[PDB]
């Protein structure tokens, strides 16, 4: 019981870290999504420019 609890408390520490990492990851990907959105647009207006 004392060891299981000890192993569980440690796992909680790593799961907290993993969670936080998952949340920051999602935000990064979203910000980059904004750029790509703009890139895709600027590229469409470069295609109709070359035509």
């Amino acid at each position: 019981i004392e060891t299981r609890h000890s192993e569980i408390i440690k796992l909680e520490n790593s799961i907290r870290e993993l969670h936080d990492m998952f949340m920051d990851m999602a935000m990064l990907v979203e910000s980059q999504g904004e750029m790509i959105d703009r890139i895709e647009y600027n590229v469409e207006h470069a295609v109709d420019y070359v035509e």
């Binding site: 019981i1 004392e2 299981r4 609890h5 569980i8 408390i9 796992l11 909680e12 799961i15 907290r16 993993l18 969670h19 998952f22 949340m23 990851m25 999602a26 990907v29 979203e30 980059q32 999504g33 790509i36 959105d37 890139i39 895709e40 590229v43 469409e44 470069a46 295609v47 420019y49 070359v50 035509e51």
Partner: protein
């Protein structure tokens, strides 16, 4: 041996609360994971269009 059963029960309760907190964290992490993967798939398609587009610009310019 009463205070002992008392401790064991306390630790067991802590271990359970910890496990439930971990379940909560994992749930929100999965939701973010799902949103992220969906965004990446979308982003993958946009980058493919961006690449085809750049080929056209580069080609018609020549």
């Amino acid at each position: 041996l009463e205070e002992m059963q008392r401790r064991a029960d306390q630790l067991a309760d802590e271990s359970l609360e910890s496990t439930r907190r971990m379940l909560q964290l994992v749930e929100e992490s999965k939701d973010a994971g799902i949103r992220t993967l969906v965004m990446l798939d979308e982003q993958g398609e946009q980058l493919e269009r961006i690449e085809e587009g750049m080929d056209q610009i580069n080609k018609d310019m020549k």
